[PDB]
Design a protein around this ligand. Structure first.
Ligand SMILES: NS(=O)(=O)c1ccc(NC(=O)Nc2ccc(F)cc2)cc1
Ligand SMILES: [Zn+2]
Length: 257
């Protein structure tokens, strides 16, 4: 099926998911001097104090930390959003080299990785229903640059050895995702899509201005994961990012000046 290689990568996805060429595809380049400050945008409300992490898992295209989304526990609200969105999972996209790896870009600049905190609109009842709606998901995107270590990321780094290959998972309870956030919650926002198949056009994107810094040792451990399953020819899980897509008839709004 689909992946990030030369014969199944982003240039191939449209054949099984024709919405790949749709009108609100993600990621995009954020042109900072074309994004307009919108003074009617509210501050984001990130309420993660009650977050309950469950598992960490290699799904053959990234690794994901999953949360209990059966109650309002870890929710995103405010910003451009109406209503309440529950945190379901987070995952990353990263490169083979530090100059590439993010999905969104900023004035064509690529960061070393990008964190996606995936939330779904509780008015649709379950995530499967939400992905069929134009306002079903809100993904909070955070850029990673290589510099100083991110202490809140180390517990994730520590366990990646135990989920090296596709299909492996581990208990990952009591993880606090607040340790992955930068200081500022200033943000760009636009309407877009999932960046992996099925590429559904169901996402309000909220991309934070301020990257987090992670150490070279931390991102190196990302690069030691495998796309393949156990026992099969080792292909390093690197460059699992979709490139920027046409902005088409969309405006990116900034919450800052
Ligand atoms: N890389 S991204 O845009 O943040 C993203 C987030 C979520 C998905 N996929 C997803 O959530 N699928 C899903 C559908 C129904 C379910 F019940 C659960 C998951 C794909 C890309
Ligand atoms: Zn993602």
């Amino acid at each position: 099926h689909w992946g990030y290689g030369k014969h199944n990568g982003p240039e191939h996805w449209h054949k099984d998911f024709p919405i790949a060429k749709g009108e609100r595809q993600s990621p995009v380049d954020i042109d900072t001097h074309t994004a307009k400050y919108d003074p009617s945008l509210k501050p984001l409300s990130v309420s993660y104090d009650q977050a309950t992490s469950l598992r960490i898992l290699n799904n053959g295209h990234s690794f994901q930390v999953t949360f209990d989304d059966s109650q309002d526990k870890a929710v995103l609200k405010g910003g451009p959003l109406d209503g309440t969105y529950r945190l379901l999972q987070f995952h990353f996209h990263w490169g083979s080299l530090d100059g590439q790896g993010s999905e969104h870009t900023v004035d064509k600049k690529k960061y070393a990785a990008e964190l996606h905190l995936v939330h779904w609109n509780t008015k649709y009842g379950d995530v499967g229903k939400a992905v069929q709606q134009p306002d079903g998901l809100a993904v909070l995107g955070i850029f990673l640059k290589v510099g100083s270590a991110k202490p809140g990321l180390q517990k994730v780094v520590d366990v990646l050895d135990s989920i090296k290959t596709e299909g492996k998972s581990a208990d990952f309870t009591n993880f606090d995702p607040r340790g992955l956030l930068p200081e500022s919650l200033d943000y760009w926002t636009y309407p877009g899509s999932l960046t992996t198949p099925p590429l559904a056009e169901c996402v309000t994107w909220i991309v934070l201005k301020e990257p987090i810094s992670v150490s070279s040792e931390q991102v190196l451990k990302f690069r030691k994961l495998n796309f393949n399953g156990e026992g099969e020819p080792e292909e390093l899980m690197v460059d699992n990012w979709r490139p920027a897509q046409p902005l088409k008839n969309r405006q990116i709004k900034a919450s800052f000046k």
